[PDB]
Amino acid sequence: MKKLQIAVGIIRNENNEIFITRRAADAHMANKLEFPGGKIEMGETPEQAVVRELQEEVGITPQHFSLFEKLEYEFPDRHITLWFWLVERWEGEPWGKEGQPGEWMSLVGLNADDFPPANEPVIAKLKRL
C-alpha cells in the first residue's frame, strides 16, 4: 500500500567501470552486482532528486548523469521503483552507493551474468549497454 523510487543511476566510467557493490572481499560467486541506491525524492524531478541524492552521499560534482532507463519491481505490498541514471564522468571519486559499498567494477558492457536476477528488468538493458 505504498510506493518509493530509488535514484541510483549506476556510474560506469573507465570503459564500463561502475561504482557498483562488487564483492569488496574475494567472493567465489560473481552475481554480487546490485545498484547504488539513493532514493529519488528531493526537489520534484529525477534531476534534482538523483543529482541532489548524488552529492548528499559522497560529495563529488561531475558524473554527467543520464537516464538510460528504469524498472519498477512490484511486491505483495511494496511498489518499488529504481531510476537508473547512468553517469560516466565523476570527479576523482564517484558518488551513488546508498548504504552499500559501491566500488569501481571493471565489468565490460554489463551482461547480467554478474548482476542478480532481482533487478532483471533493468539488468536486461545493461546487458546491451
Query: Would the annotation count 44 as a binding residue?
Result: no
36 lies in the binding site for Mg ion (CB under 5 A): no
| Contact yes or no for 97/81 (Cβ under 8 A) | no
Question: Which of the choices ligand APC, Mg ion, none does residue 80 contact, using the CB cut-off of 5 to 8 A by kind?
Answer: ligand APC
| 19 labelled ligand-binding | no
Residue 6 binding partner per list ligand APC, Mg ion, none, with a CB distance cut-off of 5 to 8 Å that depends on partner kind: ligand APC
Positions in the binding site for ligand APC (CB under 6 A): 4, 6, 37-39, 41, 73, 78, 80, 82, 98
The Cα 50–Cα 118 span in angstroms is 21
**After which residues does the chain have a break in its backbone, defined as C to next N over 2.5 Å?**
none
Residue number of the CB atom closest to ligand APC: 39
22 belongs to an annotated ligand binding site: no
Tell me how crowded residue 113 is: count the other CB atoms within 10 A of its CB.
Answer: 11
For Mg ion, give the closer residue by CB, 53 or 114. Answer: 53
Helix ranges (H only) for the chain are: 46, 52-55, 120-128
Q: How far apart are CA 59 and CA 45, in angstroms?
A: 20
Rule CB under 5 A: which residues touch Mg ion? 38-39, 53
Instruction: Mark the binding-site residues, compressed into ranges.
Output: 23, 28, 34-37, 57, 119
